[PDB]
Amino acid sequence: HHHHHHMVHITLDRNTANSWLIISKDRRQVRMGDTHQNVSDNKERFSNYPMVLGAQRFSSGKMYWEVDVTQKEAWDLGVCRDSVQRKGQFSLSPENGFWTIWLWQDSYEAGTSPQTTLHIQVPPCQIGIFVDYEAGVVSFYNITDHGSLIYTFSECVFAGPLRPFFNVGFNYSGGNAAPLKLCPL
Numbered sequence: 799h800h801h802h803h804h805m806v807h808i809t810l811d812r813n814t815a816n817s818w819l820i821i822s823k824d825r826r827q828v829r830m831g832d833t834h835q836n837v838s839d840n841k842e843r844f845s846n847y848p849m850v851l852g853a854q855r856f857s858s859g860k861m862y863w864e865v866d867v868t869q870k871e872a873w874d875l876g877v878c879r880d881s882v883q884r885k886g887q888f889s890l891s892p893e894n895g896f897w898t899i900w901l902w903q904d905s906y907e908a909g910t911s912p913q914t915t916l917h918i919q920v921p922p923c924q925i926g927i928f929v930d931y932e933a934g935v936v937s938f939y940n941i942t943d944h945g946s947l948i949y950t951f952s953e954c955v956f957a958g959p960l961r962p963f964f965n966v967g968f969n970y971s972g973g974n975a976a977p978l979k980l981c982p983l
């Protein structure tokens with residue numbers, strides 16, 4: 799692809815984080831801690847899942863960023879409305895304000911309702927995310943496989959400002975401790 803010139807510097811918003819997440823000093827990395835991280839609760843924090851939002855809000859234009867997923871077994875990535883539900887159980891779908899893909903149990907799927915099987919020959923170590931607000935597009939790219947297309951959500955109805963969205967996943971197996979990292983431009 800040729801989206802690299804729309805690169806944006808994303809940082810993580812600590813206030814939105816699940817209380818077990820550990821975000822690095824530079825706000826560019828996040829991982830699952832083995833306990834509560836000693837923060838107060840608030841109405842913004844994701845309660846049920848190890849999720850966090852980027853600080854940046856997008857309401858126009860074209861945006862691109864990259865995320866490192868090396869040696870993770872489970873994660874969700876994409877964008878979401880600023881006003882997505884934070885508390886309780888919910889599914890990642892456009893109806894609920896999410897445009898996401900994920901890895902789970904050795905398969906990759908797009909967060910449609912119901913979910914869509916992805917066809918990935920080269921397991922990605924870094925994912926590129928492109929948003930065209932005006933066109934209503936969210937696209938995902940396999941940076942490990944020379945930028946090959948993973949998935950495009952088109953005819954998106956964003957219906958609000960967008961925020962970068964992350965889920966580091968649970969670590970019940972002991973094999974999913976590794977962080978998500980925002981990759982440098």
Ligand SMILES: CC(=O)Nc1ccc2cn[nH]c2c1
Nearest residue numbers: 838839840841845884885886
């Ligand atoms: C699930 C849920 O609604 N949690 C909640 C709501 C309001 C406040 C204020 N401080 N901590 C809170 C936690």
